[PDB]
Amino acid sequence: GVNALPFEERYDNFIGGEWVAPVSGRYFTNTTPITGAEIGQIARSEAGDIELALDAAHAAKEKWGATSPAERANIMLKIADRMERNLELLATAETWDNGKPIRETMAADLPLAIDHFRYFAGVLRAQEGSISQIDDDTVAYHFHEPLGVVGQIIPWNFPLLMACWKLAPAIAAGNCVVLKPAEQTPAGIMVWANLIGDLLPPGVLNIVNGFGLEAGKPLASSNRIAKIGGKSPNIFFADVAREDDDFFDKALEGFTMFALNQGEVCTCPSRVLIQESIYDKFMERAVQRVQAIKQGDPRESDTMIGAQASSEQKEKILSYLDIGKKEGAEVLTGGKAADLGGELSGGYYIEPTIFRGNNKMRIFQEEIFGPVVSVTTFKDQAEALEIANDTLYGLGAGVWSRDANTCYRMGRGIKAGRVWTNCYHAYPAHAATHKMMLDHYQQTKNMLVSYSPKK
Amino acid sequence: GVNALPFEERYDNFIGGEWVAPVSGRYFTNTTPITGAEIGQIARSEAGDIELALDAAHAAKEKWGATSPAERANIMLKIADRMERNLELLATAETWDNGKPIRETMAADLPLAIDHFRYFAGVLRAQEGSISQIDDDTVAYHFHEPLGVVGQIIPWNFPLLMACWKLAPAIAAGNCVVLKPAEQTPAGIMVWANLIGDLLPPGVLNIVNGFGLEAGKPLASSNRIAKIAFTGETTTGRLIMQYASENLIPVTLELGGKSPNIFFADVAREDDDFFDKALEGFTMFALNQGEVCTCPSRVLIQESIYDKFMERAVQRVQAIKQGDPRESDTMIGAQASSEQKEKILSYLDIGKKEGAEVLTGGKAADLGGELSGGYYIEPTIFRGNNKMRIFQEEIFGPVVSVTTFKDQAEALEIANDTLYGLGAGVWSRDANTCYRMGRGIKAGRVWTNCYHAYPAHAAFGGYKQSGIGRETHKMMLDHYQQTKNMLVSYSPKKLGFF
Amino acid sequence: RGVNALPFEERYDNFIGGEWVAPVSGRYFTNTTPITGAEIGQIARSEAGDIELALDAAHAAKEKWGATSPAERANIMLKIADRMERNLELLATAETWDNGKPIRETMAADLPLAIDHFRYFAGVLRAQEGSISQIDDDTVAYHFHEPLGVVGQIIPWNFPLLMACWKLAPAIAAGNCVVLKPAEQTPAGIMVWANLIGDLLPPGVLNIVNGFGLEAGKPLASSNRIAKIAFTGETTTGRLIMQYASENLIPVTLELGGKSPNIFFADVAREDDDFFDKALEGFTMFALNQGEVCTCPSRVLIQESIYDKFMERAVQRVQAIKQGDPRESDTMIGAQASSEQKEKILSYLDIGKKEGAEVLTGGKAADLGGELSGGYYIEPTIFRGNNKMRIFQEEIFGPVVSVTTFKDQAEALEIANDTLYGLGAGVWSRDANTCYRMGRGIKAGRVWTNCYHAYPAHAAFGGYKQSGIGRETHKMMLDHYQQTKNMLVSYSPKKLGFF
Amino acid sequence: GDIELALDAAHAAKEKWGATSPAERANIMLKIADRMERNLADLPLAIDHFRYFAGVLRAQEGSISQIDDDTVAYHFHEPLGVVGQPLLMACWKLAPAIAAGNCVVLIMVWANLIGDLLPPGVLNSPNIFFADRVLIQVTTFKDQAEALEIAGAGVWSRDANTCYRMGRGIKAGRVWTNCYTHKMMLDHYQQTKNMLVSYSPKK
Ligand SMILES: [K+]
Ligand SMILES: [K+]
């Protein structure tokens, strides 16, 4: 179950379908953020193991992009189906490795990963090139070709959801991938590879591992492979507070979205704009809700918030929290670390903190990667747009309102890229993740053909 | 000169780039419905000129379909430029022959027609076949080809819009057209063909006039046409489908509709410009005398705002100005034919005696002077429940019926209670109500906080006993085309079994 | 369990609403295997009342299943395809037994194509997105894809399960509940497939009602409770169905049989290399499915001055076709789907003989000895005439191919196009310009170049002159089972100005 | 300074130009093409790309991805803003950007007539020959694979299985067969606004 260490020991690299040990023998320890207890040994590749990975990729490159789109899609579907029935194992691996809740892994990370695999198996079937009939004699054909080899550097935020988000398009398009998982949370990708890797031709899924300055730098700077987070407003208008029936409950539940996956999300809703005419009641219920979050051991059944990522995560979060506390950031809840006791002392927990202030303060124009939300207020829709667009960012935004004109005008006026409306943190496939990712890992072949013996 | 006559007294049959007198020698008189007078003689044709049109079309189809799509778009752009330079002549012709306000032809009709000829000349430039890689050895290439020769039966109520709603898709797609204008309004298409006759190559556009049993059936039952497009009455549509079910011919239709217009009490929340817009959108039944396929003639108003909405909407209806449609200012115009008055007056009688209390209007609109022989009915508002014939039969009159509901579920119930599925309008400020009403209404098109907008890029259609297809969109370019699927194999090695 | 053991059982009732319900009356007709004409079970005879039960269940599931998210329905379709792929042998044996098709042909092409078709349409469902149009700053039009509701389909018997899947995948991908009428020649294969997978779909999403094409085909087509009727079959029944479904305003989608040319240019035999073997393969492909293919290449057009070599080698390789028990893996051609069809091809052979066309091979029935005597086996027949004889202008659906010659490309186009059908065609040549010119010229919905009988999902397929309406096996089958909902939304509270 | 005031004008116009309907910008482009015809293989393609990109702008839709019964993702096609670039190239660039709703910053004589139509501030390889770099079967080669490993491109032949193989096997982006601009330009000067809207009141 979740309480048994999923990890095996001594994970080495995975190049060409076989577990290849480091060229220069080295193994850095796997420190689980949940407790800070060493849980495995991970290969430390420097510059040669990445070249073995590139060798396996360039050796399986020609036969994989030659595969049919239907056979490639069927391989992806088998990958997804074997990922499904092993849901608990991969979820437990990601929880142990990253400290995310076990509730948040069998509900939002794995099912999203499997659905991404199935989805990009489905977009490759429907994919088409294009014919342009220039005239009666000349025709232009546009085919989609794979890029070749692509190297992916997985972050530590979702080490399995984001890894699959970056793999599935690249494997659907027919490319061989060289992966370097981030050393903060390695070896959940090792577990996933040990689960699936034989389903792909040897050299399609290569996963080196090590340090960002050690392993990634030769990879990210390579003349072989063709290709290689801000403050998100959560505006609440006075509309949401007409009645206390079901949309205001949803509004509050969507306010407490900094505390899902410990705010390391790049689109963290860490800036909440509440209408002045509703601020008092909304913050009443919001403070009753944030303090109702159950912090504890991430891997039990129901811990809503777990360990962050590392020691550096805690130092950054604590530094930004203190800097906020200085300039006047009235704390409604939280505001420090959390020593939960038991085995949970070497961990890296931060408790959910509701800040309070104005967009001048540096907690609003600087991102924490932690469960720290910076509430503020605004007067009207125009001021809401003036404030919500005050940032050097825009990776996302969230608008809550019961008015059609308000929602559309906010969504179209906000300079974000993904505006949520009366929801937040829903990351479904086919919504831009979108079927246009397959074109990221594809080049185009243009053949212009003239069917006329004379000119 | 809008008040000056725009029609020659001898409109023959346009066939093969030239003016051809009918073989039967007969003719029929054209009546302007503004006054009831006579405005010219237009050729009466039968199954003999239908075949002349088909012969010209088939003699031009091979040369037309082989022209580049960039050559069939420059010609369309030149057609639109000519139609825009002469917007008043066409507006005046559509006014004299159809008897609708000159403002509605210089504002809606002609700009919409020019916009369609530009739009479908745009959609044609960006069109592209698909190439579906199957493996390294097999590739399927899909090409778009013209259907050949298409036959079109346009209706009267939009003489130059429904004619350009369907020529532009058909001429963009490389087909040659045999167009049959409705006998009730056969002159506007004639002036239009006069002014842009020489832009198209001979035989591509062939226009023949006549009645619906002598020049309509021969065109809509021929084996020389690839597709028959019809727009109008449902029974005539069944006639067309039966006639074209012998050569297995596509029969794209558009058959009326009884469109509701719902108000959810979110409009009466500030008495602001939005309430003003809702009031204006209520009276939209009077647009084109209510002889539009998407007529709001059913109105659903939330039970809490019925009193206020009526006490202002009756005022705005009583402010609708009627008169001679040919100067600058008439809002509600004249009916197309005398039989149109006859049907509408019979329907008004049925509504009066059924139990639909008359909020306003309810009789003819004798305007005196040189308008007594005209065809004018006063804009009318009744009030009943949905189980009454005025709610459940189309009128094409300046008539609307009003009933109320309790809540959104009842709104969907009543809005779907009819047998037609063409259109509907929704008026609310709440997003969830607007979406659930737009998606729950079993109609091909739903207007939310607007109505009677016909942009060239929004697919117009209905899915009930109201037709098959989608106008005003790039999907309609494919309705006049067919797919050639060339599945090439490149491996020169046998599969291994006979 | 085995290919040579019976794969059916007796009393296949109607599969209505995730159930097995008997007809309104105990009317039960009898299925009969073409391989050895004999009973292989007793099939329910469906009157109009069973169509009414099927439509009721389809409407209930239309209410519910309609709003099932595209990702859930695609998951159900993927699970259906996986279940079929893990039972490919059982389904293929059922198809061989009920249709007389060789087990070779089923296990090789027919069941893999059905599984690939379900996977393909689950995919194109996941990848399907509607449309938006920014009319101006204040008005947007939203084009939603919606289910049609309940659709009805009448499947032929030449490809019972393959056409059942070809029609079912887009229909249930699009959220449409289906009432499905199997051809009474081959009723019991769809039953086996249904009892296989009749637990992955919600009750009512798939309803299959088996009966005679006049007792049950008409009540299904003559119903206002279906948003569409789909048909594949003979042009007489196609015109009938067009009549019944035009009296109700419901759109129709036909796919009628065509007399498909198969042109062989004098370049196929230049170097008599493996490409020439492929061309002879393609010529012999007239006997695939025992000629019962709506796109059968039963009209071969060989260039005049290559005729000698091609016909000597091709008659050799057609005599080499091994006729035997279709349940043997070595058998290359099976039985005819019914005795009436065997009589039809025999009559057309006699017409061709009486019309002055020589017979190069075959020409009669065949008694394959043993229990196969009762079966309906026509010997692969080659005729030889010109384009004007009846057998060149009329459709046979038998292992019968008629051969003529052309002089140049223009005569090739004239002979290829001189017909009343445009369903399919085939063009064998090595010249690059010839293949494209001949594929563009030929009035055929599908044109195979340098191959033939390739039906890969995601390639469009339809009748081009008079042999049907619409396209199949492509992602735009989804649009044939969906309607567009336009929602024009104005975000400006400013009045229009007029009125 | 001069470029700075060009940028300031471009932003001031960008406030309003992006509000213009696709129909109206396409119509302005058609008027530009007409006016260029009046004052007319370089100008033909310039006019032709103005018409073509007006057409693609009229055709462009945007997606309405349906995630659930109660959740829809809308993919609008917002303009970027201000962008910066003989006359044929000038047009290949301006025609798409102006189509997308962008106030460009930059021919002179052409700019004199085109400028007034726009609102102010908006405008401111081997050559293989297969026997039936010049790779004649100038240099030479032996067989198909020979000229494949030697080697957008260009391929004269007639075998219909070497034209395809040699068109697909070349590591380039454009192969011309028996001889010797795209909607994807309009999506390069144009950004996507994804609006995920949830229509469920419950949670
Ligand atoms: K008239
Ligand atoms: K049978």
Author numbering:
A (entry chain C): 11 to 238, 266 to 469, 482 to 504
B (entry chain B): 11 to 508
C (entry chain A): 10 to 508
D (entry chain D): 58 to 97, 118 to 162, 169 to 189, 199 to 216, 269 to 276, 308 to 312, 412 to 425, 433 to 461, ...
Text lifted from the article:
Here, we show that Paracoccus denitrificans assimilates ethylene glycol solely via NAD-dependent alcohol and aldehyde dehydrogenases. We report the functional and structural characterization of EtgB and EtgA, key enzymes encoded by this etg gene cluster. We hypothesized that the alcohol dehydrogenase EtgB can convert ethylene glycol into glycolaldehyde, which is subsequently further converted into glycolate by the aldehyde dehydrogenase EtgA. The cryo-EM structures of EtgA and EtgB, determined at 3.1 and 3.0 Å resolution, respectively, provide a detailed insight into the active site of these enzymes and a starting point for structure-guided mutagenesis.
Enzyme assays revealed that EtgA readily oxidizes glycolaldehyde, albeit with a 2.5-fold lower catalytic efficiency than acetaldehyde. In contrast, the inter-dimer contacts show energetically unfavorable ΔG values of +2.3 and +4.5 kcal/mol, consistent with weak contacts between the ‘dimer-of-dimers’, resulting in flexibility and a weak definition of the cryo-EM map. EtgA is structurally similar to other bacterial aldehyde dehydrogenases and has a canonical active site with catalytic Cys and Glu residues. The aldehyde dehydrogenase EtgA efficiently converts glycolaldehyde into glycolate, enabling the subsequent conversion of glycolate to glyoxylate, which then enters central carbon metabolism via the BHAC.
